[PDB]
Design a protein around this ligand. Structure first.
Ligand SMILES: Cc1cc2nc3c(=O)[nH]c(=O)nc-3n(C[C@H](O)[C@H](O)[C@H](O)COP(=O)(O)OP(=O)(O)OC[C@H]3O[C@@H](n4cnc5c(N)ncnc54)[C@H](O)[C@@H]3O)c2cc1C
Ligand SMILES: [Cl-]
Length: 344
C-alpha cells in the first residue's frame, strides 16, 4: 500500500517536505500545533543559499516563484560601533512569513491540519500519533519537522537542547523615523559590544526587526525581569552605548524573550525505522545564518529519497545519515563561533 506519511510541523522543513512528497504523488498530512491565523505575524528577513534553500525550492518546483517574489535589491550588512555609533559596510532575500506563505500557497487546502499539537509518538500497524486535542492518527512514515522543542525528538531521545548563555530580546519598529531608517538601510546592521549586542534588519514592509542579544544567565534574567519587566531590563543594559543606537533600541514597542538554545555537536539518537528528524528537530544550533537553509535542504533530501526509491524505510535511513553527517560537520563552528560574538 502507498505509505501514510505524517509530517509534524508546518515550518520551512515540514512544508518543503510536504510539497516535494505531494508533487511525487505521495499521501501526506502536516500536523501543525498553531491555529491557521499565525503566519503573517512572522516577518524577520533571511536569504536562501544557492547550495541549500534554493536547491530545496528547485526540488519542490518553486525556485522561479521564489525568484519572482524575492528582493534582489543589493541589501548590504552594516557594522555599528556600539560606543561611537559609527556605521560602515562589509543574495535573494524573503521575509520568513512570505517564505512560509509561498510553500502554503503551493499546497492543496487539506494538507495542513492546524491546531494539531503532537503530545505522543507510540511505535509498533506502523506509528501512533496523539494530539493535545485528543485526535489520534496512525502513520507508516513520521517526519519530525517540529522545531527546537520537537515532540518527535522527545520520542527518539531524552537529550534536550542546552542554553548557550545568550538570550535575544526581539522588538519591532513598525514605522521607523527617517534617521534610524537611514542608519539601518535596506539590509542589516550588526553591533557587537561584548556581552551586549544589537542586530537590526529591515523587512520587505519597511519594518525594523530588533534583536537585543544579552550574555546573561537564565537565573539572572529571571530575577531582573521579575522585578523590572522585559523592556526596562533590555534598555537598561545598553546605557553605555552611543545615543544613536540607544534611540533605535528605545523605538521598539515591546520585546519577546527568546533564549538561545542549541543541541550539542555530539547529539545522537538511536535510528528508528520509519521515523526521522529534519531542521531544528534534528540539529538546532545557534542563529549563525544556517537554520532555514538546512531545514529546507534536509526536507528536500528526505522527501526526494521517499519519491525516488520504493523502499521507504531504507530511503529515510540513508537520507537521515546525510542530514546528520552534514549538521555534525557544521555544529562545532556554529556553537563556538556564536560564543565568540560575545567575548570581552
Ligand atoms: C532569534 C533567531 C533568529 C534567527 N535568524 C535566522 C536567520 O537569520 N536565518 C536563518 O536561516 N535562520 C534563522 N534562525 C533559525 C530558523 O528560525 C530556524 O532554524 C528554522 O525556522 C527551522 O525550521 P524548522 O522547519 O526546522 O522549524 P520551525 O520553523 O521552528 O517550525 C517548527 C514548526 O513545528 C510546530 N510545532 C512545534 N511543536 C509541535 C508539536 N508538538 N506538534 C505540532 N507542531 C509542532 C511549530 O509551531 C512550527 O510551525 C533564527 C532563529 C532565532 C531563534
Ligand atoms: Cl540560523
Amino acid at each position: 500500500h502507498p505509505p501514510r506519511i505524517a509530517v509534524i510541523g508546518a515550518g520551512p522543513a515540514g512544508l518543503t517536505a510536504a510539497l516535494i512528497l505531494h508533487r511525487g504523488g505521495h499521501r501526506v498530512s502536516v500536523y501543525e500545533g498553531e491555529a491557521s491565523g499565525q503566519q503573517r505575524t512572522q516577518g524577520g528577513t533571511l536569504d536562501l543559499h544557492d547550495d541549500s534553500g534554493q536547491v530545496a525550492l528547485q526540488r519542490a518546483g518553486l525556485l522561479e516563484a521564489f525568484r519572482a517574489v524575492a528582493r534582489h535589491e543589493g541589501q548590504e550588512a552594516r557594522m555599528g560601533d556600539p560606543w561611537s555609533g559609527e556605521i560602515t559596510t562589509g543574495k535573494p532575500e524573503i521575509d520568513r512569513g512570505d517564505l512560509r506563505q509561498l510553500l502554503l500557497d503551493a499546497l492543496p487546502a487539506d494538507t495542513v491540519q492546524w491546531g494539531h499539537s503532537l503530545t505522543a509518538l507510540v511505535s509498533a500497524n506502523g506509528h501512533g500519533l496523539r494530539f493535545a486535542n485528543g485526535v489520534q492518527r496512525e502513520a507508516d512514515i513520521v517526519i519530525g519537522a517540529d522545531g527546537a522543542w520537537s515532540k518527535v525528538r522527545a520520542a527518539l531521545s531524552t537529550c534536550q537542547p542546552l542554553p548557550t548563555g545568550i538570550t535575544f530580546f526581539e522588538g519591532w519598529i513598525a514605522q521607523p523615523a527617517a534617521d534610524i531608517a537611514a542608519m539601518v538601510g535596506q539590509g542589516s546592521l550588526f553591533c557587537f559590544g561584548g556581552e551586549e549586542a544589537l542586530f537590526v534588519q529591515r523587512n520587505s514592509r519597511d519594518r525594523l526587526c530588533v534583536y537585543a542579544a544579552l550574555k546573561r544567565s537564565s537565573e539572572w534574567l529571571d530575577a531582573q525581569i521579575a522585578q523590572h519587566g522585559i523592556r526596562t531590563l533590555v534598555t537598561g543594559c545598553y546605557t553605555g552605548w552611543a545615543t544613536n543606537l540607544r534611540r533605535l533600541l528605545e523605538a521598539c514597542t515591546d520585546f519577546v524573550r527568546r533564549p538561545i538554545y542549541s543541541l550539542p555537536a555530539d547529539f545522537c539518537w538511536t535510528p528508528r525505522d520509519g521515523v526521522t528528524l529534519i531542521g531544528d528537530a534534528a540539529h538546532l544550533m545557534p542563529p549563525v545564518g544556517v537554520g532555514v537553509n538546512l531545514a529546507m535542504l534536509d526536507a528536500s533530501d528526505v522527501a526526494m529519497a521517499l519519491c525516488a526509491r520504493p523502499d521507504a524505510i531504507s530511503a529515510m535511513r540513508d537520507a537521515e545519515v546525510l542530514v546528520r553527517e552534514r549538521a555534525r560537520a557544521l555544529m562545532p563552528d556554529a556553537i563556538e563561533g556564536f560564543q565568540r560574538w560575545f567575548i570581552t
